[PDB]
Amino acid sequence: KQRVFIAGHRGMVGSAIRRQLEQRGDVELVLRTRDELNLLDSRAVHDFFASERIDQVYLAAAKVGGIVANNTYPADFIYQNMMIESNIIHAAHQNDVNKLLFLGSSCIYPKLAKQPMAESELLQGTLEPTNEPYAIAKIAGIKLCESYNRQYGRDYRSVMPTNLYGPHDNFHPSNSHVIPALLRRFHEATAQNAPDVVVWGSGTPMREFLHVDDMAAASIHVMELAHEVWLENTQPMLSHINVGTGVDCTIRELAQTIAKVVGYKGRVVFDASKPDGTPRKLLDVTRLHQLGWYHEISLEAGLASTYQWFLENQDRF
Amino acid sequence: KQRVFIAGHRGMVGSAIRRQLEQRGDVELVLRTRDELNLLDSRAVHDFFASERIDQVYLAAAKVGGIVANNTYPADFIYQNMMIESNIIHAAHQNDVNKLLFLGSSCIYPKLAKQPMAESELLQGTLEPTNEPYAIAKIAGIKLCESYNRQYGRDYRSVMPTNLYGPHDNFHPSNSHVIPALLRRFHEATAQNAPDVVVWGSGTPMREFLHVDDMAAASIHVMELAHEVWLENTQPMLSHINVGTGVDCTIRELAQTIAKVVGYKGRVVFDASKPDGTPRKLLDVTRLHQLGWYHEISLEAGLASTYQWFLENQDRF
């Protein structure tokens, strides 16, 4: 019986992975809360790996946030993510944990990358200023994995998800991510019977979204693949795997779909006097598809279930 | 009286900085050996900064090595450099040390960068595979500095040196750096009266070299510049300063000059059946020159004094 440690099991991705592994008896979960185990503490992390008998590690713990948070606390974002990555990855190796899955982010890609973005786009150009500190920490996480694989013959894999959404997301008013921000605004506009909802921009830019449960499924899939199969579809120094739908849709289509899901009858208005971001941004998921994994949750379906979750948990935001 | 901590004062660059600061009484040096203070230990480093009263920090400690070492121990190179950087930079901030100088490397630049390489070439393309792990750690070091400067209003500066040489370099046979490797080979070839010395390649590629004492001088200069002057010549997210001569010379000229300095009378032969590296590689030192610093040690002069040092210390290699 495989003993699995999911670091950061209370976060959005961590909890999604936990939900799916809990639904099988060939796995026994070892979980620690931030209060029980301080991930920034090297000694604490090493002590934990020495005391427990871990077979696999899902490194889902991270200091994440929106546009405001990343620009307001840059030092906390780079430092904490670097320490969490280093502590877990090194302690794991020191205690013979051969399997590990590192969950990265989509922010690691160059601001002006070629679309769709293949894995080889990594480090090909300058990063988005807003995400620079966080992105550098994530890239260092991937390179730590590759370096331990090369030097010690470890099996430390990594996956880079596109924009995620789903239950346990940050629905607070402070969150800048488009899906939870719009679900919240359309909900209140519907409740207050507001004539319209104005969204900044033209609505033309294209984005890719993946439900967190599909993310968890792909993660576990990649983690459980045969080592020879994984090696065959990656390179030692270009080992990460993009996880997404490969399907893009305009912000206009997204907003309009959220309005429908929530039952909003007012008007959705795009203020084109405000600037748009990059025109298009999506991942090339060829590598993932060749590994035999395809997403199941469609946008409309994922937004409907996510909204349902928000309804039963709104007294938390 | 300024209390200065030079991390890694026994290394090549650390010791060069120490030699120059020791020659002035307006500075009091706080030094710890690797045995006295384990830089990889967070608690130890924080305890040190809490107990001592540091005003400035020269972060010259690093896990460095040649071509063989970087490809053989990639995990040790990325992990150790990341921990040393994170520990010192964070402990410094936690204990109110407002001034810090981070010594990077030239390896951080893209393999196919535009020549000469300006600071803005950082993160513009893929890294040299051999140096990838070490380079990622160094870049993370620069971004930590920038992030603490942005978030906490710190004054954490950084300098990226070109190829260095001088006393306390690694003259062991295992070292791949061209200057110490060639000084050693020409010395023995001269002693053994060998008819010739064969060097791989055509001798046409161009490289830049800086004596470690000039490096130390530039470092202290940049560290001591007025904050307003430094801010005026850098950007918050592009804050590093290239340190070098801006002068390049062929490997052929370098080899030929070393032969002369050592008194070798045989023939220097370049085997063109072996591949060369990139044709040219040197730093754009415009930013440094505008800050009013210019190197003093010329190549011939620097090699002669470095050889002299090697002679008086050969019973160590």
XYZ file of C-alpha atoms in Angstrom:
634
model
C 0.000 0.000 0.000
C 1.537 3.239 -1.336
C 2.027 5.925 1.334
C 1.445 9.324 -0.305
C 2.281 12.775 1.078
C 0.363 15.660 -0.446
C 2.035 18.900 0.618
C -0.503 21.719 0.856
C -3.563 19.441 0.810
C -5.884 22.309 1.878
C -5.096 24.489 -1.143
C -7.141 24.333 -4.349
C -4.972 21.842 -6.288
C -3.780 19.946 -3.220
C -7.346 19.289 -2.053
C -8.420 18.220 -5.549
C -5.636 15.606 -5.627
C -6.596 14.476 -2.117
C -10.280 14.110 -3.065
C -9.356 11.716 -5.861
C -6.780 9.614 -4.000
C -9.039 9.230 -0.988
C -11.351 7.347 -3.372
C -9.050 4.284 -3.533
C -7.662 1.890 -0.941
C -4.345 1.083 -2.637
C -3.114 4.418 -1.293
C -2.718 5.644 2.273
C -2.519 9.428 2.701
C -0.089 11.197 5.039
C -1.265 14.784 5.547
C 0.030 17.627 7.695
C -1.483 21.083 8.177
C 0.632 24.261 8.011
C 0.280 24.339 11.796
C 1.430 20.702 12.148
C 4.358 21.021 9.722
C 6.080 24.266 8.823
C 7.246 23.775 5.231
C 9.657 26.730 5.460
C 11.546 24.932 8.245
C 14.278 22.659 6.799
C 14.795 20.688 10.039
C 11.050 20.206 10.524
C 10.635 18.898 6.955
C 13.653 16.566 7.229
C 12.423 15.284 10.598
C 9.042 14.539 9.039
C 10.502 12.570 6.123
C 12.764 10.687 8.556
C 9.866 9.740 10.887
C 7.252 8.874 8.240
C 7.628 6.281 5.512
C 6.725 8.158 2.310
C 6.612 6.454 -1.093
C 5.348 9.372 -3.210
C 5.161 13.156 -2.900
C 2.718 15.550 -4.587
C 4.339 18.956 -4.125
C 1.219 21.117 -4.333
C 2.154 23.595 -1.608
C 2.881 27.121 -2.840
C 2.491 30.802 -1.998
C -0.051 31.828 -4.686
C -2.059 34.987 -5.319
C -3.435 37.523 -7.747
C -2.046 40.542 -9.568
C -2.116 42.767 -6.478
C -0.480 40.186 -4.186
C 2.353 39.337 -6.611
C 3.269 43.012 -7.070
C 2.760 43.908 -3.414
C 4.679 41.057 -1.758
C 7.297 40.033 -4.356
C 9.907 38.967 -1.745
C 7.445 36.667 0.069
C 6.459 35.016 -3.213
C 9.965 34.218 -4.424
C 11.442 33.355 -1.016
C 8.640 31.158 0.300
C 8.211 29.212 -2.906
C 11.972 28.676 -3.163
C 12.186 27.409 0.436
C 9.131 25.097 0.172
C 10.478 23.559 -3.078
C 14.071 23.136 -1.790
C 13.066 21.735 1.603
C 10.673 19.080 0.292
C 12.720 18.026 -2.747
C 15.971 17.723 -0.775
C 14.392 16.056 2.287
C 12.649 13.618 -0.048
C 15.929 12.596 -1.655
C 17.752 12.403 1.689
C 15.101 9.917 2.860
C 14.875 7.769 -0.253
C 11.569 8.986 -1.641
C 12.099 8.197 -5.325
C 8.789 9.525 -6.689
C 7.650 13.128 -6.644
C 5.343 15.320 -8.702
C 5.932 19.071 -8.753
C 2.948 21.268 -9.680
C 4.104 24.389 -11.406
C 2.192 27.158 -13.155
C 1.509 28.699 -16.544
C 3.222 31.974 -15.499
C 6.627 30.425 -16.138
C 6.348 31.033 -19.884
C 7.755 34.090 -21.702
C 5.291 36.989 -21.960
C 5.596 36.977 -25.774
C 5.786 33.215 -26.303
C 4.735 31.510 -29.565
C 1.123 30.238 -29.354
C 0.174 27.592 -28.479
C 3.025 27.303 -25.961
C 4.990 24.071 -26.142
C 7.205 22.993 -23.230
C 10.278 24.141 -25.162
C 9.079 27.718 -24.819
C 10.473 27.692 -21.279
C 13.199 30.305 -20.719
C 12.873 31.620 -24.313
C 12.148 35.230 -23.451
C 11.338 37.737 -20.771
C 8.698 37.052 -18.136
C 5.542 39.033 -17.328
C 6.754 41.589 -14.706
C 3.788 40.941 -12.407
C 4.678 37.258 -12.124
C 8.445 37.458 -12.351
C 9.363 36.555 -8.718
C 6.851 33.697 -8.509
C 7.828 32.428 -11.984
C 11.533 32.330 -11.146
C 10.782 30.253 -8.053
C 8.664 27.806 -10.097
C 11.315 27.401 -12.796
C 13.918 26.754 -10.059
C 11.559 24.038 -8.767
C 11.537 22.309 -12.165
C 15.330 22.525 -12.448
C 15.788 21.075 -8.956
C 13.738 18.057 -10.062
C 15.750 17.613 -13.281
C 19.037 18.011 -11.384
C 18.128 15.318 -8.810
C 16.958 13.058 -11.638
C 20.268 13.526 -13.488
C 22.619 13.309 -10.479
C 20.854 10.797 -8.234
C 18.706 8.845 -10.652
C 15.509 10.116 -9.036
C 12.014 10.143 -10.578
C 10.911 13.729 -9.889
C 8.283 14.716 -12.433
C 6.581 18.084 -12.979
C 3.400 19.409 -14.585
C 2.566 23.001 -15.657
C -1.182 23.707 -15.520
C -2.944 26.417 -17.562
C -5.498 28.725 -15.814
C -7.377 26.702 -13.210
C -10.736 27.074 -11.558
C -13.101 25.039 -9.426
C -14.008 24.460 -5.767
C -11.731 25.896 -3.058
C -10.589 28.666 -5.315
C -10.218 32.146 -3.873
C -13.677 33.672 -4.370
C -12.823 36.669 -2.181
C -13.307 40.130 -3.820
C -9.537 40.593 -3.708
C -8.862 37.726 -6.188
C -7.908 38.854 -9.692
C -8.412 35.508 -11.495
C -11.117 36.015 -14.080
C -13.358 32.995 -13.357
C -13.851 33.386 -9.561
C -13.948 37.189 -9.959
C -16.648 37.026 -12.631
C -18.674 34.286 -10.880
C -18.824 36.567 -7.856
C -19.714 39.736 -9.776
C -22.426 38.095 -11.875
C -23.874 36.487 -8.748
C -24.227 39.817 -6.958
C -25.374 41.676 -10.065
C -28.088 38.991 -10.454
C -29.052 39.236 -6.768
C -29.140 43.064 -6.872
C -30.902 42.960 -10.243
C -28.303 45.341 -11.779
C -29.110 46.511 -15.339
C -25.550 45.756 -16.537
C -22.069 44.485 -15.655
C -19.138 46.338 -17.169
C -15.962 44.379 -17.863
C -12.740 46.204 -18.811
C -11.341 45.495 -22.258
C -12.784 44.462 -25.616
C -13.515 40.836 -24.710
C -11.540 39.626 -27.741
C -8.449 38.142 -26.063
C -8.320 34.359 -25.905
C -7.591 32.261 -22.808
C -7.521 28.615 -21.796
C -9.188 27.225 -18.674
C -9.030 23.835 -16.967
C -11.215 22.562 -14.127
C -9.175 21.655 -11.029
C -10.564 18.090 -11.004
C -9.272 17.494 -14.495
C -5.985 18.964 -13.245
C -5.886 16.471 -10.350
C -6.659 13.589 -12.740
C -3.869 14.512 -15.166
C -1.475 14.940 -12.232
C -2.117 11.476 -10.815
C -1.957 10.044 -14.331
C 1.483 11.539 -15.040
C 2.665 10.559 -11.565
C 1.612 6.936 -12.129
C 2.920 6.485 -15.683
C 5.646 3.879 -16.215
C 9.068 5.475 -15.842
C 10.122 4.207 -19.294
C 7.002 5.755 -20.827
C 7.662 9.110 -19.153
C 11.368 9.127 -20.135
C 10.386 8.301 -23.693
C 8.147 11.378 -23.918
C 10.344 13.955 -22.197
C 14.011 15.033 -22.096
C 16.208 15.149 -18.951
C 16.559 18.906 -19.208
C 13.093 19.626 -20.651
C 11.012 17.322 -18.489
C 7.883 19.276 -17.568
C 4.496 18.446 -19.044
C 1.866 21.059 -19.946
C -1.577 20.234 -18.573
C -4.628 21.856 -20.150
C -7.441 21.597 -22.692
C -5.655 23.079 -25.691
C -8.965 24.857 -26.374
C -9.212 28.624 -26.167
C -12.173 30.979 -25.867
C -12.574 34.760 -25.776
C -13.164 36.665 -22.557
C -16.483 37.660 -24.160
C -17.516 34.016 -24.528
C -16.396 33.323 -20.945
C -18.311 36.290 -19.487
C -21.421 35.468 -21.513
C -21.310 31.810 -20.366
C -20.891 32.792 -16.708
C -23.877 35.175 -17.048
C -25.991 32.273 -18.340
C -24.817 29.792 -15.646
C -25.682 32.278 -12.896
C -29.061 33.227 -14.376
C -28.139 36.891 -14.964
C -30.681 38.714 -17.155
C -28.946 42.071 -17.412
C -26.470 43.192 -20.033
C -22.798 42.243 -20.253
C -20.851 45.277 -21.412
C -17.209 45.419 -22.483
C -15.528 48.779 -22.052
C -13.069 48.907 -24.981
C -11.511 52.123 -23.730
C -9.495 49.879 -21.359
C -6.488 47.883 -22.670
C -6.451 44.141 -23.272
C -3.617 41.816 -22.286
C -1.883 39.556 -24.825
C -4.285 38.502 -27.628
C -3.952 34.801 -26.999
C -2.543 32.463 -24.456
C -2.903 28.703 -24.340
C -0.748 25.619 -23.878
C 0.293 23.057 -26.469
C -0.845 19.822 -24.804
C 0.504 17.463 -27.496
C 2.924 15.794 -25.067
C 0.115 15.193 -22.566
C -2.228 13.748 -25.180
C 0.505 11.422 -26.426
C 0.816 10.208 -22.826
C -2.826 9.208 -23.252
C -4.644 11.792 -21.133
C -7.553 13.978 -22.219
C -9.717 16.329 -20.151
C -13.332 15.475 -19.334
C -14.874 18.634 -17.876
C -16.116 21.150 -20.466
C -16.326 24.876 -19.618
C -20.123 25.206 -19.237
C -20.221 22.030 -17.156
C -17.264 23.093 -15.011
C -18.637 26.581 -14.348
C -22.052 25.224 -13.402
C -20.629 22.791 -10.814
C -18.133 25.392 -9.549
C -20.993 27.909 -9.088
C -22.925 25.247 -7.200
C -19.955 24.844 -4.863
C -19.732 28.609 -4.387
C -23.443 28.701 -3.450
C -23.089 26.099 -0.705
C -19.960 27.857 0.652
C -20.506 31.578 0.139
C -20.431 32.191 3.887
C -16.634 31.961 3.833
C -16.039 34.878 1.450
C 32.934 52.023 11.930
C 31.155 49.837 9.342
C 30.892 46.164 10.353
C 31.178 44.055 7.183
C 30.400 40.350 6.745
C 32.042 38.670 3.777
C 30.404 35.281 3.267
C 32.865 32.799 1.775
C 35.968 34.889 2.521
C 38.307 31.943 1.743
C 37.112 31.537 -1.850
C 38.780 33.334 -4.761
C 36.481 36.393 -4.936
C 35.707 36.468 -1.218
C 39.402 36.565 -0.295
C 40.101 39.268 -2.889
C 37.407 41.485 -1.333
C 38.797 40.743 2.136
C 42.358 41.646 1.082
C 41.194 45.086 -0.020
C 38.914 45.899 2.922
C 41.513 44.798 5.443
C 43.594 47.690 4.070
C 41.385 50.353 5.722
C 40.377 51.091 9.302
C 36.914 52.534 8.627
C 35.743 48.937 8.259
C 35.720 46.085 10.757
C 35.454 42.587 9.260
C 33.255 39.814 10.664
C 34.370 36.490 9.176
C 33.244 32.916 9.752
C 34.695 29.728 8.270
C 32.478 26.994 6.784
C 33.258 25.049 9.957
C 32.268 27.989 12.205
C 29.074 28.833 10.296
C 27.161 26.417 8.103
C 25.608 28.599 5.394
C 23.149 25.850 4.393
C 21.647 25.960 7.899
C 18.838 28.567 8.103
C 18.756 28.643 11.929
C 22.545 28.933 12.157
C 22.589 31.859 9.696
C 19.696 33.650 11.440
C 21.342 33.117 14.833
C 24.544 34.644 13.478
C 22.820 37.760 12.122
C 20.911 38.108 15.410
C 24.084 37.854 17.554
C 26.403 40.004 15.412
C 25.797 43.600 14.405
C 26.271 43.598 10.614
C 26.045 46.775 8.528
C 26.968 45.342 5.109
C 27.074 41.916 3.467
C 29.233 40.758 0.543
C 27.572 37.528 -0.573
C 30.580 35.856 -2.187
C 29.887 32.322 -0.974
C 28.916 29.860 -3.708
C 29.287 26.263 -4.866
C 31.471 26.793 -7.977
C 33.296 24.434 -10.327
C 34.307 23.491 -13.835
C 32.627 21.742 -16.746
C 32.982 18.275 -15.210
C 31.699 19.317 -11.766
C 28.634 21.175 -13.101
C 27.559 18.192 -15.224
C 28.455 15.608 -12.588
C 26.827 17.194 -9.524
C 23.961 19.296 -10.946
C 21.701 18.837 -7.873
C 24.424 20.000 -5.448
C 25.079 23.097 -7.557
C 21.483 24.285 -7.799
C 20.433 23.287 -4.271
C 23.433 24.620 -2.365
C 23.552 27.918 -4.198
C 19.804 28.394 -3.721
C 20.042 27.691 0.028
C 23.117 29.919 0.605
C 21.455 32.831 -1.266
C 18.047 32.445 0.462
C 19.476 31.996 3.961
C 21.784 35.023 3.885
C 19.436 37.390 2.033
C 16.442 36.568 4.252
C 18.412 36.533 7.533
C 19.950 39.863 6.543
C 16.541 41.449 6.047
C 15.119 39.893 9.225
C 17.962 41.544 11.168
C 17.896 44.964 9.539
C 20.982 44.703 7.361
C 20.059 47.208 4.651
C 23.149 46.839 2.437
C 24.174 43.731 0.549
C 26.162 42.930 -2.577
C 25.457 39.688 -4.425
C 28.246 38.339 -6.658
C 26.805 36.461 -9.565
C 28.419 34.994 -12.668
C 28.662 35.369 -16.426
C 26.980 31.959 -16.966
C 23.574 33.515 -16.352
C 23.403 34.865 -19.907
C 21.704 33.081 -22.832
C 24.033 30.775 -24.781
C 23.293 32.678 -28.018
C 23.160 36.194 -26.574
C 23.883 39.331 -28.647
C 27.532 40.438 -28.244
C 28.656 42.322 -26.281
C 26.122 41.230 -23.648
C 24.250 44.059 -21.966
C 22.417 43.472 -18.673
C 19.108 43.347 -20.554
C 20.229 40.115 -22.181
C 19.251 38.329 -18.966
C 16.528 35.703 -19.477
C 16.399 36.366 -23.258
C 17.108 32.831 -24.401
C 18.142 29.348 -23.441
C 21.085 28.709 -21.138
C 24.251 26.686 -21.793
C 23.269 23.127 -20.677
C 26.497 22.633 -18.717
C 25.759 25.654 -16.535
C 21.986 25.479 -16.399
C 21.517 24.421 -12.722
C 24.124 26.870 -11.405
C 22.794 29.672 -13.645
C 19.214 29.225 -12.453
C 20.378 29.504 -8.845
C 22.322 32.708 -9.624
C 19.394 34.324 -11.437
C 17.142 33.439 -8.465
C 19.715 35.220 -6.270
C 19.401 38.413 -8.330
C 15.596 38.251 -8.247
C 15.585 37.752 -4.471
C 17.587 40.980 -4.150
C 15.235 42.908 -6.464
C 12.176 41.516 -4.657
C 13.456 42.593 -1.207
C 14.363 45.997 -2.642
C 10.850 46.413 -4.086
C 8.867 45.028 -1.124
C 10.953 46.139 1.856
C 12.869 49.101 0.506
C 16.190 47.292 0.895
C 19.483 48.146 -0.843
C 20.547 44.729 -2.166
C 22.835 45.224 -5.145
C 24.360 42.631 -7.488
C 27.294 42.382 -9.893
C 27.889 39.831 -12.702
C 31.604 39.265 -13.364
C 33.037 37.991 -16.672
C 35.702 35.198 -16.613
C 37.928 35.709 -13.583
C 41.441 34.667 -12.733
C 44.096 35.439 -10.157
C 45.433 34.142 -6.828
C 43.438 31.477 -4.956
C 41.961 30.169 -8.146
C 41.651 26.424 -8.601
C 44.981 25.456 -10.185
C 44.292 21.742 -9.701
C 44.479 19.577 -12.891
C 40.734 19.003 -12.594
C 39.868 22.704 -13.218
C 38.485 23.446 -16.682
C 38.882 27.258 -16.619
C 41.257 28.191 -19.403
C 43.658 30.515 -17.532
C 44.569 28.299 -14.522
C 44.504 25.205 -16.772
C 46.884 26.762 -19.295
C 49.180 28.324 -16.656
C 49.605 24.845 -15.212
C 50.172 23.085 -18.545
C 52.675 25.637 -19.839
C 54.520 25.514 -16.516
C 54.973 21.748 -16.680
C 55.699 21.722 -20.408
C 58.432 24.326 -19.714
C 59.804 22.305 -16.780
C 59.762 19.044 -18.788
C 61.128 20.868 -21.834
C 58.299 19.493 -24.044
C 58.657 20.279 -27.778
C 55.008 21.422 -28.024
C 51.692 21.976 -26.234
C 48.551 21.036 -28.124
C 45.378 22.982 -27.379
C 42.015 21.776 -28.736
C 40.253 24.065 -31.183
C 41.333 26.680 -33.718
C 42.274 29.391 -31.215
C 40.003 31.891 -32.990
C 37.172 32.244 -30.454
C 37.178 35.438 -28.417
C 36.873 35.688 -24.626
C 37.031 38.340 -21.930
C 39.085 38.037 -18.745
C 39.228 40.117 -15.570
C 41.762 39.871 -12.744
C 40.118 39.049 -9.397
C 41.609 42.166 -7.756
C 39.946 44.384 -10.310
C 36.779 42.387 -9.594
C 37.089 43.099 -5.851
C 37.672 46.812 -6.556
C 34.595 47.136 -8.781
C 32.540 45.229 -6.201
C 33.447 47.542 -3.329
C 32.929 50.532 -5.617
C 29.387 49.484 -6.578
C 28.641 48.564 -2.969
C 29.733 52.016 -1.766
C 28.041 54.139 -4.445
C 25.353 56.578 -3.290
C 21.949 54.904 -3.375
C 20.547 57.692 -5.588
C 23.421 57.212 -8.034
C 22.855 53.450 -8.193
C 19.062 53.812 -8.622
C 19.655 56.332 -11.379
C 21.759 53.848 -13.363
C 19.695 50.690 -12.919
C 16.032 49.593 -12.950
C 14.207 47.856 -10.055
C 13.714 44.720 -12.109
C 16.968 44.922 -14.104
C 19.352 45.903 -11.336
C 22.505 43.847 -11.877
C 25.725 45.406 -13.119
C 28.153 43.674 -15.498
C 31.754 43.810 -14.301
C 34.553 43.284 -16.813
C 37.064 44.862 -19.190
C 34.902 45.020 -22.302
C 38.056 43.923 -24.154
C 38.209 40.564 -25.883
C 41.111 38.465 -27.139
C 41.404 35.157 -28.992
C 42.300 31.919 -27.245
C 45.382 31.959 -29.498
C 46.477 35.331 -28.115
C 45.796 34.109 -24.563
C 47.774 30.871 -25.008
C 50.655 32.689 -26.695
C 50.788 35.282 -23.873
C 50.760 32.594 -21.171
C 53.614 30.791 -22.994
C 55.654 34.013 -22.898
C 54.872 34.783 -19.212
C 55.970 31.285 -18.188
C 59.127 31.304 -20.319
C 58.032 28.396 -22.547
C 60.249 27.987 -25.629
C 58.393 25.154 -27.326
C 55.601 25.414 -29.854
C 51.958 26.234 -29.149
C 49.799 24.124 -31.436
C 46.056 24.424 -32.010
C 44.333 21.247 -33.123
C 41.552 22.521 -35.422
C 40.050 19.064 -35.773
C 38.388 19.763 -32.387
C 35.313 22.054 -32.173
C 35.322 25.594 -30.820
C 32.693 27.029 -28.488
C 30.750 30.200 -29.345
C 32.846 32.585 -31.502
C 32.701 35.467 -29.078
C 31.665 36.181 -25.565
C 32.151 39.390 -23.631
C 30.158 41.765 -21.449
C 28.907 45.245 -22.278
C 30.327 47.251 -19.364
C 28.752 50.596 -20.347
C 26.678 50.755 -17.151
C 29.772 50.115 -15.023
C 31.844 52.743 -16.817
C 29.058 55.295 -16.415
C 29.199 54.542 -12.680
C 32.798 55.732 -12.964
C 34.765 52.492 -12.640
C 37.463 51.230 -14.996
C 39.776 48.229 -14.639
C 43.485 48.671 -13.926
C 45.086 45.255 -14.425
C 45.946 44.406 -18.047
C 46.137 40.762 -19.201
C 49.942 40.402 -19.473
C 50.374 42.119 -16.112
C 47.651 40.038 -14.461
C 48.982 36.727 -15.788
C 52.523 37.536 -14.690
C 51.482 38.309 -11.090
C 49.068 35.348 -11.014
C 51.883 33.026 -12.201
C 54.100 34.449 -9.472
C 51.430 33.541 -6.923
C 51.148 30.036 -8.367
C 54.937 29.602 -8.032
C 54.979 30.476 -4.335
C 51.974 28.181 -3.688
C 52.342 25.231 -6.047
C 52.678 22.828 -3.124
C 48.908 22.937 -2.622
C 47.956 21.581 -6.056
